[PDB]
Ligand binder design. Structure first.
Ligand SMILES: CCCCCCCCCCCCCCCC(=O)O
Lengths: 121, 268, 238, 57, 255, 238, 125, 57
């Protein structure tokens, strides 16, 4: 068999990463890359079949959700792309008040948090 | 057939056809024979080219994109929308609600790219155009399993033949298409505002089924939309300003018309 | 094998053609139609409604509402001119952006009569009389009321009914006139003159405005689809 | 089962049409529907207005 | 005998009288009615109050000055907080109604001017910045009127609506608007203008809080003018009466 | 030689086309048909049968049968919530893998009513009453019984007949709702609340389970063939 | 066949089911109806919502304890702040309606007790 | 020997078909067979069950 199939959601577990000879009937395990959270229904294992081809692979992990943005006083929050990992919210202000401008959901430690805090306006 | 003129003569009555009040908003139905003496001439002219169908029933290019047989961009995608170009958009915007069947036609043309590979002897290229309805598995790569096109519709064209053409029925969850929308995606009056909220026509993909030659080749697909069986409601004024975006009606302010010398000038 | 023969014009894509083609979504069930108020069946239906004419399109006046107001005021003289413009709905800047003009710019030939409705927007205590004249071509624009009286005119008396309609007829040798600027298909000149003088009582404004509407007549007709000059684009939007 | 209809000719000679597909969205375009009713846009008023009479009397 | 310059309208427990009126414009020639069984889609039974909902509501007044550009009103939004109409459309998910609009202006025989009163269906508007879209507060004014602007709104990082009067915020031509059922108030001829509008939409019913079907635009085409000594404060008042209103999908109140 | 002309769309392979083609095995004699029980003529026939709904799909519960059990137990309180989920058969994880959901994921538009059948699986000596409510969109999910009572509800009394059916009607402005997630075509919320309290005698378990079945109504309908998102493949099998 | 211990009631968009019920008591033998033209006094036209107003509203619950004396509810007051009913009676000066009351208690075969459920007209206290 | 049948059109115009081959397996697809009978899968019980009556009585 060749190298196991690359998947955006997960990454090959150690030490399979440092391995280049896979006989038939060899099982490899994956793990969720940051932030990505493991999906309980799907199981992250692949087997080299007799045809020297790996078993069908599906995304075993899903993007983590950032907390709710909140409610900026005298301000409007624009959420064009949800609140998943990698989204960007926009902070605006009403007519008659002066105002950062945007915040990004990024991995900070073991979970995902917003970057810029809510401004004042 | 257009209405023929009626012969009249002099008049000294109390009937005042010319005098009227436009405050009501009623357009005056006066004919030349009311304010002058006229002859009777039969009119054989016809309003046959002014019907809604004959007006919008013509092919118009709405998009074109380029994909290659090597490198990075191996396939092309397009989110179906008629607002990409200006001419057909402005012709359609004459009406608020329109219901029409669509006759789609595709033109595909290839071109050899400058390189340094010797001994180039290409073969005939075949192209595949796959339409994915919203919610379907979009291709992530050119050799994707989704290209099987079991349920999804697909068209295969070999270069040198007549351009592919298919007919699409009135697709809409409503009772008519909306050229204009005055609302928000969310019930709380926040989020996407405009006709973009209503739009949901899916995505269209295109690829080379074979590499064809050891040298680089770039293909370009052109999409043509001819409306047929057209029914329209509520007409509205034509776009005075120039368009700027496809998702919205945002514009830059412009004057009502073009300026002349004085109010008594017979020339532009 | 039925013996056939292919004629020229085979495997070609003429954009204005009318053929059948296989449906991509077979046996699709469309949403049943519903009654919607205001159905358009003919473009002429749109051309027969009034549209305010930007007559005073001079200088920066096009960047406001002042382009729609015709400024008539009381003066110590008689027989002066109020306005004048040519009968070119497709080409003249005056009628180019009106509903009639915006519909004409999609075609190449036009033929029929033109209705002009003038509405007095002064005080209820003001009065006046105006001469509204149309002169077919052959001799230039009339420079004085004596020359404009010899054409097709109407004498409008301002009173309870504030609107008067001047109907420009069809006096063209050609059956159809070109929408673009052609000196062969000349149209004529439309002018307006003070018949008497505006009469205003004390404590009443002596400077008033008139408004003008244009509409197509029942005999109107147009005959060649084309592309509007105004629409433009440098690159695909978004 | 063919349809024979008149063509568009000048004033002052029939054509034949057969449908081959079974979807009614694949037919040709309807180019010959000459019907008008401009009373909805011109004259949308409630009380009728005779031409010769004064509008406001 | 009769004249034709006098007209009375009676709806619910309200009445409107007029001494100097033009005719009455009726939508696209269609009178508002209820929904038929052969054109409905929702299955539960609708509610039809028919008395409290179908009555004349009088919004605030606006002063017409020598330099006023004009005002606009979104009708589903204007009556959202007023009377049972607001309570009905609040609890319900779907709604369907036709709007009759009466706009009244009062003056003397020595005052001059001209207003265009027009009902625009689906008046989608633009933003001063080409990128970005207009904010709900700028587009929708409730319990109040929004005003156009004589000069172009500046473009910056903002969500303000382009209010140019000559482009009517839609980028089109103000003169060409007449295509929509309209009327004029010529201060020398008529005190008030009345327009009856049916329900126009592409679907049978619609949520009355996220979509505004029609917009009323009052635009002075000829500026108000008078000589010193006569009244300087001339207001404009708008009365709206819902007609044949039905609602479906009773649910928890939406604020 | 009959003169013909070739139109665009010639020598092309549209996968959803309907033409005749020469048979590769001419005059082949097929095996005569025989009566086989359970013939399917329409997919909707399959969508109108009940299918157990995995309501409690929380955590590892999807890796067992516990995903099908709704855990109702006696408590010292009233008006609490049992469950709640949105009306999205195509998109919601709750209805995505049910027979109805598996059939919907092959299409794009759906339209009709939904039947939910709740069966009590407790002791024969247990009793209770439940409120089963549906709220159309516009205001968010009801957070308490007072807000959920104002919608379309049924009060179910547990007795000899252990199954009660809640029929979600069609209250959509659009004729057809999108199977994918679109905020324009919102569906609403379905919730359940303790009407009274579970009444259990001594020596009888006080913790019971409910089960839920979903079926399409007679008015149900779907309108656009597409490809299921769930099916996948990295390379040809075997 | 049938039993008589099962009864369903449908009003507006609401339904009530019962497996163990006695009969249904109907007021004084009179079923609620509208006001006739020969018995009315007010002259303006009435409003009849008939769907949102005519539906089942569920008040709070009360715990029955070994020493509970009893509870009372004023119906015009109980529904005053609940649903469109409250909004209708709020804006309007005059009102006229009939009330159907359903009271439900759940127990086992090992629990004992007895409740009287009574509608008192003009219960001046 | 042609067949003329109605097409699939919206609610609220005939097509012509000729068979050229002699195998009956080369014809077009049968797209217009709208016949249902869900009583085999729904309600497969032996004793009829009226809706308004109790199921087990
Ligand atoms: C084999 C290729 C099939 C391609 C199918 C493409 C279908 C496109 C459908 C577009 C319909 C018209 C959209 C109008 C949008 C609007 O105005 O709201």
């Amino acid at each position: 068999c060749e190298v196991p199939t690359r998947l955006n959601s997960a990454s090959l577990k150690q030490p399979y990463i440092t391995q280049n000879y896979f006989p038939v009937g060899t099982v490899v395990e994956y793990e969720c890359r940051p932030g990505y959270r493991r999906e309980p229904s799907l199981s992250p294992k692949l087997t080299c079949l007799q045809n020297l081809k790996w078993s069908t692979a599906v995304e075993f992990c899903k993007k983590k959700s950032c907390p709710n943005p909140g409610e900026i006083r005298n301000g409007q929050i624009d959420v064009p792309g949800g609140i998943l990992f990698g989204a960007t919210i926009s902070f605006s202000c009403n007519t008659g008040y002066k105002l950062s401008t945007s915040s990004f959901c990024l991995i900070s430690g073991s979970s995902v948090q917003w970057s810029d805090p809510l401004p004042e306006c | 057939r257009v209405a023929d003129t009626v012969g009249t003569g002099p008049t000294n009555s109390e009937a005042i056809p010319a005098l009227t009040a436009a405050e009501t908003g009623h357009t005056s139905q006066v004919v030349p024979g009311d304010t002058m003496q006229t002859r009777h001439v039969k009119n054989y002219h016809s309003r046959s080219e002014s019907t809604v169908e004959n007006f919008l029933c013509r092919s118009a290019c709405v998009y074109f994109t380029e994909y290659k047989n090597s490198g990075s961009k191996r396939y092309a995608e397009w989110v179906v929308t008629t607002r990409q170009a200006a001419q057909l958009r402005r012709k359609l915007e004459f009406f608020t609600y329109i219901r029409f069947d669509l006759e789609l036609t595709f033109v595909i043309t290839s071109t050899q790219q400058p390189s340094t590979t010797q001994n180039q002897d290409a073969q005939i290229l075949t192209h595949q155009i796959m339409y994915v309805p919203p919610g379907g598995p979009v291709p992530d790569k050119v050799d994707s399993y989704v290209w099987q096109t079991s349920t999804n519709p697909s068209v295969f064209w070999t270069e040198g033949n007549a351009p592919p053409r298919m007919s699409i029925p009135f697709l809409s969850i409503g009772n008519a298409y909306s050229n204009f929308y005055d609302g928000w995606s969310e019930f709380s009056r926040n989020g996407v505002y405009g006709i973009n909220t209503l739009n949901n026509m899916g995505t269209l993909y295109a690829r080379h089924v074979n590499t064809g030659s050891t040298g680089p080749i770039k293909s370009t697909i052109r999409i043509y939309f001819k409306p047929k069986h057209v029914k329209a409601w509520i007409p509205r004024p034509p776009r005075l300003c120039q368009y700027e975006k496809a998702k919205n009606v945002n514009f830059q302010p412009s004057g009502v018309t073009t300026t002349r010398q004085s109010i008594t000038t017979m020339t532009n | 094998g039925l013996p056939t023969m292919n004629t020229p014009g085979s495997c070609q894509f003429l954009t204005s053609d009318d053929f059948q083609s296989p449906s991509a979504m077979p046996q699709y069930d469309v949403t049943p139609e519903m009654k919607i108020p205001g159905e358009v069946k003919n473009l002429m239906e749109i051309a027969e409604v009034d549209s305010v004419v930007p007559v005073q399109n001079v200088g920066e006046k096009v960047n406001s509402m002042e382009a729609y107001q015709i400024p008539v005021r009381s003066n110590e003289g008689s027989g002066t001119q109020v306005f004048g413009f040519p009968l070119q709905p497709g080409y003249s800047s005056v009628f180019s952006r009106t509903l009639l003009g915006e519909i004409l710019n999609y075609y190449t030939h036009w033929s029929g009569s033109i209705k002009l409705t003038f509405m007095f927007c002064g005080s209820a205590m003001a009065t006046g009389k105006f001469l509204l004249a149309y002169s077919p071509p052959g001799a230039g624009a009339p420079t004085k009321r004596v020359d404009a009286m010899l054409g097709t005119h109407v004498v409008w008396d301002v009173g309870l009914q504030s609107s008067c309609v001047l109907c420009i007829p069809w006096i063209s040798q050609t059956h159809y006139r070109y929408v673009a600027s052609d000196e062969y298909t000349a149209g004529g000149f439309i002018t307006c003159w003070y018949q008497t003088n505006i009469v205003v009582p004390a404590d009443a404004q002596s400077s008033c405005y008139i408004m003008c509407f244009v509409s197509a007549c029942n005999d109107f007709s147009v005959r060649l689809l084309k592309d509007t000059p105004f629409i433009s684009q440098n690159s695909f939007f978004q | 089962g063919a349809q024979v209809s008149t063509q568009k000719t000048g004033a002052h000679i029939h054509y034949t049409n057969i449908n081959y597909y079974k979807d009614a969205a694949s037919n040709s375009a309807t180019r010959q529907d000459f019907a008008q009713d401009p009373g909805k846009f011109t004259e949308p008023v409630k009380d009728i207005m005779i031409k010769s009479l004064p509008a406001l009397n | 005998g009769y004249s034709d310059r006098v007209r009375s309208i009676t709806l619910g427990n309200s009445t409107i009288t007029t001494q100097e009126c033009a005719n009455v414009v009726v939508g696209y020639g269609v009178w508002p009615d209820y929904l038929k069984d052969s054109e409905a889609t929702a299955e539960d039974q609708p509610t039809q109050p028919d008395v409290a909902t179908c009555r004349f509501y009088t919004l605030d007044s606006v002063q017409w000055q020598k330099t006023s550009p004009g005002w606009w009103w979104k009708l589903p939004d204007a009556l959202s907080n007023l009377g049972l109409f607001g309570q009905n459309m609040q609890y319900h998910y779907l709604g369907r109604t036709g709007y009759t609009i009466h706009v009244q202006c009062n003056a003397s025989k020595f005052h001059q001017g001209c207003l265009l009163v027009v009902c625009v269906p689906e008046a989608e508007m633009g933003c001063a910045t080409l990128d970005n879209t207009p904010s709900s507060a700028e587009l929708l004014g409730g319990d109040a009127a929004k005003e156009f602007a004589g000069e172009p709104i500046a473009s910056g990082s903002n969500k303000l609506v382009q209010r140019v009067v000559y482009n009517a915020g839609m980028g089109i031509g103000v003169g060409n608007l007449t295509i929509f059922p309209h009327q004029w108030i010529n201060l020398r001829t008529n005190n008030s203008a009345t327009i009856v509008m049916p329900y126009t939409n592409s679907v049978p019913m619609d949520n009355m809080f996220r979509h505004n079907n029609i917009t009323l635009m009052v635009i002075p085409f000829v500026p108000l003018d008078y000589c010193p000594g006569s009244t300087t404060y001339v207001p404009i008042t708008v009365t709206i009466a819902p007609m044949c209103a039905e609602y479906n999908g009773l649910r928890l109140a939406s604020h």
